[PDB]
Amino acid sequence: IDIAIRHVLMRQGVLGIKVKIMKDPAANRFGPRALPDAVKIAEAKDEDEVIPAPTVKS
């Protein structure tokens, strides 16, 4: 989060504004590239074709 607070001076009073923004965590380059709780799961490599007992000479 980048936080910016500025006071705007009107003729009738003060307007204190706060523009609070985020860049994409995956767009971060130096710190963590996601939230702490971000759990990412890879895909399965199972469901292959298995054959009884071959032997390959290379």
Partner RNA sequence: CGGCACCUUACGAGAAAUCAAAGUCUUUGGGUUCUGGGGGGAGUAUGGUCGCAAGGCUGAAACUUAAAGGAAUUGACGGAAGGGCACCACCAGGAGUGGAGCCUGCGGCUUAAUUUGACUCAACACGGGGAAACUCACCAGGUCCAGACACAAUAAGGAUUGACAGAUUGAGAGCUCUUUCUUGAUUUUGUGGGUGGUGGUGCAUGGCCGUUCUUAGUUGGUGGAGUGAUUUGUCUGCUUAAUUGCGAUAACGAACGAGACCUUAACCUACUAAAUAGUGCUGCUAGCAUUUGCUGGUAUAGUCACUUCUUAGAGGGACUAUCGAUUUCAAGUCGAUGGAAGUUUGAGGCAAUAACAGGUCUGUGAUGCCCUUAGACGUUCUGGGCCGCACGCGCGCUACACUGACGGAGCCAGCGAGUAUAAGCCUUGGCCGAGAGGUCUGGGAAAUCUUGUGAAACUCCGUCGUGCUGGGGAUAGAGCAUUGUAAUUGUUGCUCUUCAACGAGGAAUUCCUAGUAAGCGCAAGUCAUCAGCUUGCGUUGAUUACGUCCCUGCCCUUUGUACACACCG
Using CB under 7 A as the binding rule, whether residue 35 contacts RNA is answered as yes
Find out whether 28 and 15 touch, Cβ atoms under 8 Å.
Answer: no
How far is Cα 38 from Cα 26, in angstroms, rounded to an integer?
A: 11
List the one residue from 4, 9, 19, 21 that touches RNA (CB under 7 A): 9
Closer residue to RNA in complex, CB, 10/56: 10
CB 16 within 8 A of CB 5: yes
Q: Is 5 in the site for RNA (CB under 7 A)?
A: yes
User: Which chain residues interact with RNA by CB under 7 A?
Assistant: 5, 7, 9, 11-18, 35-37
